[PDB]
Design goal:
By secondary structure, this protein is mainly β. The chain is built from 3 helices and 14 strands. It is classed as de novo protein.
Protein backbone atom coordinates (compact mmCIF):
# COMPACT_ATOMS: atom_id res chain seq x y z
CA UNK A 1 0.00 0.00 0.00
CA UNK A 2 0.96 3.57 -0.81
CA UNK A 3 0.19 5.11 2.63
CA UNK A 4 1.12 8.71 1.88
CA UNK A 5 0.60 10.90 -1.21
CA UNK A 6 3.56 10.02 -3.54
CA UNK A 7 4.53 11.18 -7.07
CA UNK A 8 3.63 8.67 -9.78
CA UNK A 9 7.28 8.74 -10.94
CA UNK A 10 8.47 7.61 -7.54
CA UNK A 11 6.25 4.54 -7.57
CA UNK A 12 6.73 3.59 -11.24
CA UNK A 13 10.34 4.14 -12.17
CA UNK A 14 10.00 3.17 -15.80
CA UNK A 15 9.31 6.41 -17.70
CA UNK A 16 6.96 4.76 -20.14
CA UNK A 17 5.02 2.90 -17.48
CA UNK A 18 4.76 6.09 -15.32
CA UNK A 19 3.21 7.77 -18.38
CA UNK A 20 0.84 4.85 -18.69
CA UNK A 21 -0.40 5.20 -15.14
CA UNK A 22 -0.68 9.03 -15.57
CA UNK A 23 -2.84 8.55 -18.64
CA UNK A 24 -4.99 5.90 -17.02
CA UNK A 25 -5.70 8.14 -14.02
CA UNK A 26 -6.03 11.24 -16.30
CA UNK A 27 -3.43 13.09 -14.29
CA UNK A 28 -1.59 16.03 -15.85
CA UNK A 29 1.97 14.99 -14.93
CA UNK A 30 3.99 11.97 -13.74
CA UNK A 31 5.15 14.26 -10.87
CA UNK A 32 1.50 14.38 -9.68
CA UNK A 33 0.97 12.62 -6.37
CA UNK A 34 -1.32 9.64 -5.92
CA UNK A 35 -2.86 7.76 -3.04
CA UNK A 36 -3.59 4.08 -2.76
CA UNK A 37 -7.29 4.87 -3.05
CA UNK A 38 -6.60 6.19 -6.65
CA UNK A 39 -4.37 3.19 -7.47
CA UNK A 40 -7.11 0.90 -6.19
CA UNK A 41 -9.44 2.29 -8.93
CA UNK A 42 -7.19 0.91 -11.69
CA UNK A 43 -8.62 -2.36 -13.01
CA UNK A 44 -7.31 -2.32 -16.61
CA UNK A 45 -4.05 -1.34 -18.18
CA UNK A 46 -3.87 -1.37 -21.93
CA UNK A 47 -0.33 -0.51 -22.86
CA UNK A 48 0.79 -2.67 -25.73
CA UNK A 49 3.70 -1.31 -27.83
CA UNK A 50 4.63 1.36 -25.33
CA UNK A 51 8.38 0.83 -24.88
CA UNK A 52 7.95 -0.36 -21.32
CA UNK A 53 11.11 -1.91 -19.81
CA UNK A 54 9.82 -2.57 -16.29
CA UNK A 55 6.47 -2.79 -14.60
CA UNK A 56 7.87 -2.11 -11.14
CA UNK A 57 5.15 -0.39 -9.14
CA UNK A 58 2.39 -2.52 -10.59
CA UNK A 59 2.40 -4.36 -7.25
CA UNK A 60 0.38 -1.40 -5.99
CA UNK A 61 -2.50 -2.13 -8.40
CA UNK A 62 -4.16 -4.98 -6.55
CA UNK A 63 -7.37 -4.74 -8.54
CA UNK A 64 -5.87 -5.05 -11.99
CA UNK A 65 -7.95 -7.53 -14.02
CA UNK A 66 -6.97 -6.86 -17.65
CA UNK A 67 -3.36 -6.30 -18.46
CA UNK A 68 -2.18 -5.78 -21.99
CA UNK A 69 1.63 -5.38 -22.18
CA UNK A 70 2.44 -6.95 -25.61
CA UNK A 71 5.17 -5.43 -27.69
CA UNK A 72 7.23 -3.88 -24.86
CA UNK A 73 10.70 -4.66 -23.56
CA UNK A 74 9.95 -6.69 -20.52
CA UNK A 75 12.35 -9.27 -19.19
CA UNK A 76 10.98 -9.71 -15.72
CA UNK A 77 7.33 -10.34 -14.64
CA UNK A 78 7.81 -11.24 -11.01
CA UNK A 79 5.99 -8.01 -10.07
CA UNK A 80 2.75 -9.69 -11.29
CA UNK A 81 2.78 -12.57 -8.84
CA UNK A 82 0.35 -11.12 -6.26
CA UNK A 83 -2.12 -9.62 -8.82
CA UNK A 84 -4.80 -12.14 -7.89
CA UNK A 85 -7.59 -10.38 -9.81
CA UNK A 86 -5.90 -10.88 -13.20
CA UNK A 87 -8.28 -12.35 -15.73
CA UNK A 88 -6.49 -11.43 -18.95
CA UNK A 89 -2.78 -11.16 -19.47
CA UNK A 90 -0.93 -10.28 -22.65
CA UNK A 91 2.84 -10.49 -22.43
CA UNK A 92 3.43 -11.26 -26.15
CA UNK A 93 6.43 -9.90 -27.97
CA UNK A 94 8.63 -8.99 -25.01
CA UNK A 95 12.09 -10.21 -24.05
CA UNK A 96 11.10 -12.97 -21.64
CA UNK A 97 13.73 -15.68 -21.49
CA UNK A 98 12.48 -17.42 -18.40
CA UNK A 99 9.46 -17.50 -16.17
CA UNK A 100 10.03 -17.28 -12.44
CA UNK A 101 9.27 -20.30 -10.33
CA UNK A 102 5.76 -19.85 -9.07
CA UNK A 103 4.97 -16.67 -10.96
CA UNK A 104 1.41 -17.69 -11.89
CA UNK A 105 0.69 -19.68 -8.69
CA UNK A 106 -1.84 -17.15 -7.32
CA UNK A 107 -3.45 -16.06 -10.66
CA UNK A 108 -6.35 -18.35 -10.28
CA UNK A 109 -8.74 -16.10 -12.16
CA UNK A 110 -6.72 -15.99 -15.38
CA UNK A 111 -8.66 -16.94 -18.49
CA UNK A 112 -6.26 -15.82 -21.19
CA UNK A 113 -2.45 -15.97 -21.03
CA UNK A 114 -0.48 -14.79 -24.05
CA UNK A 115 3.29 -15.50 -23.85
CA UNK A 116 3.88 -15.64 -27.58
CA UNK A 117 6.89 -14.11 -29.37
CA UNK A 118 9.27 -14.33 -26.43
CA UNK A 119 12.54 -16.31 -26.01
CA UNK A 120 11.31 -19.06 -23.72
CA UNK A 121 13.14 -22.40 -23.99
CA UNK A 122 11.56 -24.39 -21.23
CA UNK A 123 8.73 -24.04 -18.73
CA UNK A 124 9.32 -24.63 -14.95
CA UNK A 125 7.67 -27.60 -13.35
CA UNK A 126 4.11 -26.68 -12.18
CA UNK A 127 4.18 -23.30 -14.00
CA UNK A 128 0.48 -23.42 -14.99
CA UNK A 129 -0.80 -25.92 -12.40
CA UNK A 130 -3.11 -23.48 -10.56
CA UNK A 131 -4.76 -21.91 -13.63
CA UNK A 132 -8.10 -23.66 -13.26
CA UNK A 133 -10.02 -21.12 -15.28
CA UNK A 134 -7.51 -20.77 -18.17
CA UNK A 135 -9.29 -21.10 -21.53
CA UNK A 136 -6.58 -19.69 -23.81
CA UNK A 137 -2.85 -20.39 -23.69
CA UNK A 138 -0.61 -18.96 -26.41
CA UNK A 139 3.06 -19.99 -26.28
CA UNK A 140 3.74 -19.59 -30.05
CA UNK A 141 6.96 -18.22 -31.45
CA UNK A 142 9.30 -19.10 -28.59
CA UNK A 143 12.21 -21.59 -28.61
CA UNK A 144 10.45 -24.12 -26.39
CA UNK A 145 12.16 -27.54 -26.49
CA UNK A 146 11.16 -29.02 -23.25
CA UNK A 147 7.74 -29.66 -21.89
CA UNK A 148 7.04 -32.51 -19.52
CA UNK A 149 3.77 -34.34 -19.74
CA UNK A 150 2.27 -32.60 -16.70
CA UNK A 151 2.62 -29.06 -18.07
CA UNK A 152 -1.08 -28.85 -19.04
CA UNK A 153 -2.64 -31.23 -16.43
CA UNK A 154 -5.84 -30.02 -14.78
CA UNK A 155 -6.12 -27.16 -17.29
CA UNK A 156 -9.54 -28.72 -17.73
CA UNK A 157 -11.11 -25.62 -19.13
CA UNK A 158 -8.49 -25.07 -21.86
CA UNK A 159 -10.11 -24.37 -25.16
CA UNK A 160 -7.32 -22.87 -27.30
CA UNK A 161 -3.66 -23.96 -27.25
CA UNK A 162 -1.04 -22.44 -29.54
CA UNK A 163 2.37 -24.10 -29.49
CA UNK A 164 3.29 -23.17 -33.03
CA UNK A 165 6.83 -22.01 -33.96
CA UNK A 166 8.76 -23.82 -31.21
CA UNK A 167 11.19 -26.76 -31.09
CA UNK A 168 9.06 -29.63 -29.84
CA UNK A 169 10.08 -32.26 -32.43
CA UNK A 170 12.41 -34.25 -30.07
CA UNK A 171 9.55 -34.91 -27.69
CA UNK A 172 7.44 -36.84 -30.12
CA UNK A 173 10.15 -39.09 -31.54
CA UNK A 174 9.31 -42.72 -30.64
CA UNK A 175 12.87 -43.20 -29.46
CA UNK A 176 12.83 -40.15 -27.13
CA UNK A 177 14.44 -41.47 -23.89
CA UNK A 178 11.66 -42.35 -21.46
CA UNK A 179 9.18 -42.34 -24.31
CA UNK A 180 7.39 -39.57 -26.20
CA UNK A 181 5.69 -36.83 -24.22
CA UNK A 182 1.87 -37.15 -24.18
CA UNK A 183 1.36 -33.52 -23.19
CA UNK A 184 -2.18 -33.30 -24.62
CA UNK A 185 -3.54 -35.83 -22.07
CA UNK A 186 -6.97 -35.02 -20.66
CA UNK A 187 -7.71 -31.81 -22.57
CA UNK A 188 -11.31 -32.79 -23.23
CA UNK A 189 -12.55 -29.21 -23.78
CA UNK A 190 -9.81 -28.17 -26.23
CA UNK A 191 -11.27 -26.88 -29.48
CA UNK A 192 -8.27 -25.26 -31.21
CA UNK A 193 -4.78 -26.71 -31.34
CA UNK A 194 -1.93 -25.21 -33.30
CA UNK A 195 1.22 -27.33 -33.48
CA UNK A 196 2.53 -25.90 -36.72
CA UNK A 197 6.28 -25.15 -37.33
CA UNK A 198 7.80 -27.45 -34.74
CA UNK A 199 9.89 -29.73 -36.99
CA UNK A 200 7.74 -32.75 -36.07
CA UNK A 201 8.53 -35.86 -38.08
CA UNK A 202 6.66 -38.44 -35.91
CA UNK A 203 3.13 -38.27 -34.29
CA UNK A 204 2.87 -40.63 -31.32
CA UNK A 205 -0.02 -43.04 -31.55
CA UNK A 206 -3.12 -41.90 -29.67
CA UNK A 207 -1.46 -38.54 -28.92
CA UNK A 208 -4.74 -36.79 -29.76
CA UNK A 209 -7.12 -39.41 -28.36
CA UNK A 210 -8.51 -37.25 -25.46
CA UNK A 211 -9.25 -34.24 -27.62
CA UNK A 212 -12.87 -35.13 -28.17
CA UNK A 213 -13.98 -31.47 -28.53
CA UNK A 214 -11.28 -30.57 -31.05
CA UNK A 215 -12.58 -28.56 -34.04
CA UNK A 216 -9.35 -27.08 -35.48
CA UNK A 217 -6.02 -28.84 -35.81
CA UNK A 218 -3.05 -27.12 -37.48
CA UNK A 219 -0.04 -29.41 -38.09
CA UNK A 220 1.31 -27.37 -40.96
CA UNK A 221 4.94 -26.63 -41.78
CA UNK A 222 6.39 -29.66 -40.13
CA UNK A 223 8.29 -32.71 -41.50
CA UNK A 224 5.50 -35.17 -41.15
CA UNK A 225 6.00 -38.27 -43.31
CA UNK A 226 4.25 -41.06 -41.40
CA UNK A 227 0.76 -40.93 -40.29
CA UNK A 228 -1.00 -44.17 -39.72
CA UNK A 229 -4.62 -44.06 -40.38
CA UNK A 230 -5.83 -43.80 -36.78
CA UNK A 231 -4.19 -40.46 -35.78
CA UNK A 232 -7.50 -38.66 -35.94
CA UNK A 233 -9.61 -41.40 -34.38
CA UNK A 234 -12.67 -40.26 -32.50
CA UNK A 235 -11.94 -36.59 -33.37
CA UNK A 236 -15.38 -36.47 -34.80
CA UNK A 237 -16.00 -32.82 -34.28
CA UNK A 238 -12.97 -31.91 -36.39
CA UNK A 239 -13.91 -29.18 -38.85
CA UNK A 240 -10.63 -27.65 -39.89
CA UNK A 241 -7.45 -29.67 -40.60
CA UNK A 242 -4.26 -28.05 -41.92
CA UNK A 243 -1.55 -30.56 -42.94
CA UNK A 244 0.05 -28.27 -45.52
CA UNK A 245 3.85 -28.10 -45.96
CA UNK A 246 4.70 -31.61 -44.71
CA UNK A 247 6.12 -34.73 -46.44
CA UNK A 248 3.03 -36.95 -46.72
CA UNK A 249 3.57 -37.82 -50.43
CA UNK A 250 4.70 -41.44 -50.08
CA UNK A 251 1.56 -42.38 -48.05
CA UNK A 252 -0.66 -41.71 -51.09
CA UNK A 253 1.27 -43.68 -53.71
CA UNK A 254 -0.48 -46.84 -55.01
CA UNK A 255 2.89 -48.65 -54.71
CA UNK A 256 3.34 -47.66 -51.06
CA UNK A 257 3.97 -50.85 -49.03
CA UNK A 258 1.24 -51.80 -48.41
CA UNK A 259 -1.37 -49.55 -49.99
CA UNK A 260 -2.16 -45.82 -49.42
CA UNK A 261 -2.79 -44.70 -45.82
CA UNK A 262 -6.45 -43.60 -45.56
CA UNK A 263 -5.79 -41.11 -42.77
CA UNK A 264 -8.94 -39.01 -43.45
CA UNK A 265 -11.37 -41.86 -42.75
CA UNK A 266 -14.37 -40.95 -40.63
CA UNK A 267 -14.08 -37.15 -40.77
CA UNK A 268 -17.68 -36.57 -41.61
CA UNK A 269 -17.79 -33.03 -40.06
CA UNK A 270 -14.59 -31.72 -41.72
CA UNK A 271 -15.25 -28.56 -43.77
CA UNK A 272 -11.74 -27.19 -44.44
CA UNK A 273 -8.82 -29.36 -45.46
CA UNK A 274 -5.41 -28.01 -46.50
CA UNK A 275 -3.10 -30.64 -48.03
CA UNK A 276 -1.07 -28.20 -50.09
CA UNK A 277 2.72 -28.48 -50.44
CA UNK A 278 3.15 -32.17 -49.51
CA UNK A 279 4.76 -33.41 -52.73
CA UNK A 280 1.69 -35.54 -53.57
CA UNK A 281 2.13 -37.20 -57.00
CA UNK A 282 -1.09 -39.23 -56.70
CA UNK A 283 -4.49 -39.03 -55.04
CA UNK A 284 -6.04 -42.45 -54.17
CA UNK A 285 -9.55 -42.74 -55.52
CA UNK A 286 -11.20 -43.33 -52.16
CA UNK A 287 -9.21 -41.05 -49.93
CA UNK A 288 -11.96 -38.43 -49.53
CA UNK A 289 -14.91 -40.78 -49.46
CA UNK A 290 -16.01 -39.99 -45.93
CA UNK A 291 -15.70 -36.14 -46.20
CA UNK A 292 -19.41 -35.42 -46.50
CA UNK A 293 -19.14 -31.90 -45.08
CA UNK A 294 -16.06 -30.77 -47.03
CA UNK A 295 -16.45 -27.27 -48.38
CA UNK A 296 -12.88 -26.11 -49.01
CA UNK A 297 -10.14 -28.49 -50.25
CA UNK A 298 -6.64 -27.15 -50.93
CA UNK A 299 -4.41 -29.47 -52.93
CA UNK A 300 -2.25 -26.68 -54.45
CA UNK A 301 1.49 -26.79 -54.87
CA UNK A 302 1.82 -30.52 -55.19
CA UNK A 303 2.99 -32.83 -57.97
CA UNK A 304 -0.33 -34.12 -59.30
CA UNK A 305 -0.42 -35.12 -62.99
CA UNK A 306 -3.84 -36.69 -62.99
CA UNK A 307 -6.85 -37.38 -60.80
CA UNK A 308 -8.83 -40.61 -60.66
CA UNK A 309 -12.25 -40.35 -62.30
CA UNK A 310 -14.88 -39.52 -59.64
CA UNK A 311 -12.44 -38.72 -56.80
CA UNK A 312 -14.49 -35.60 -55.77
CA UNK A 313 -17.99 -36.94 -56.49
CA UNK A 314 -19.09 -37.86 -52.97
CA UNK A 315 -18.12 -34.19 -51.97
CA UNK A 316 -21.54 -32.64 -52.42
CA UNK A 317 -20.81 -29.51 -50.31
CA UNK A 318 -17.51 -28.67 -51.96
CA UNK A 319 -17.35 -25.00 -52.89
CA UNK A 320 -13.64 -24.26 -53.22
CA UNK A 321 -11.19 -26.72 -54.81
CA UNK A 322 -7.65 -25.33 -55.19
CA UNK A 323 -5.64 -27.44 -57.59
CA UNK A 324 -3.25 -24.60 -58.57
CA UNK A 325 0.44 -25.18 -59.32
CA UNK A 326 0.22 -28.89 -59.98
CA UNK A 327 1.00 -30.49 -63.39
CA UNK A 328 -2.68 -31.13 -64.22
CA UNK A 329 -4.61 -30.75 -67.56
Amino acid sequence: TITVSTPIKQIFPDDAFAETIKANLKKKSVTDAVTQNELNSIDQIIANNSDIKSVQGIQYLPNVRYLALGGNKLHDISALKELTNLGWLNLSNNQLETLPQGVFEKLTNLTTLNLSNNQLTSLPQGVFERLASLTTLNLSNNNIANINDQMLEGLTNLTTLNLSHNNLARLWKHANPGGPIYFLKGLTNLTTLNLSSNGFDEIPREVFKDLTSLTTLNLSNNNIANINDQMLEGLTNLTTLNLSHNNLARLWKHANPGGPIYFLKGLTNLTTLNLSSNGFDEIPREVFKDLTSLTTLNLSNNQLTSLPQGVFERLTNLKTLNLSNNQLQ
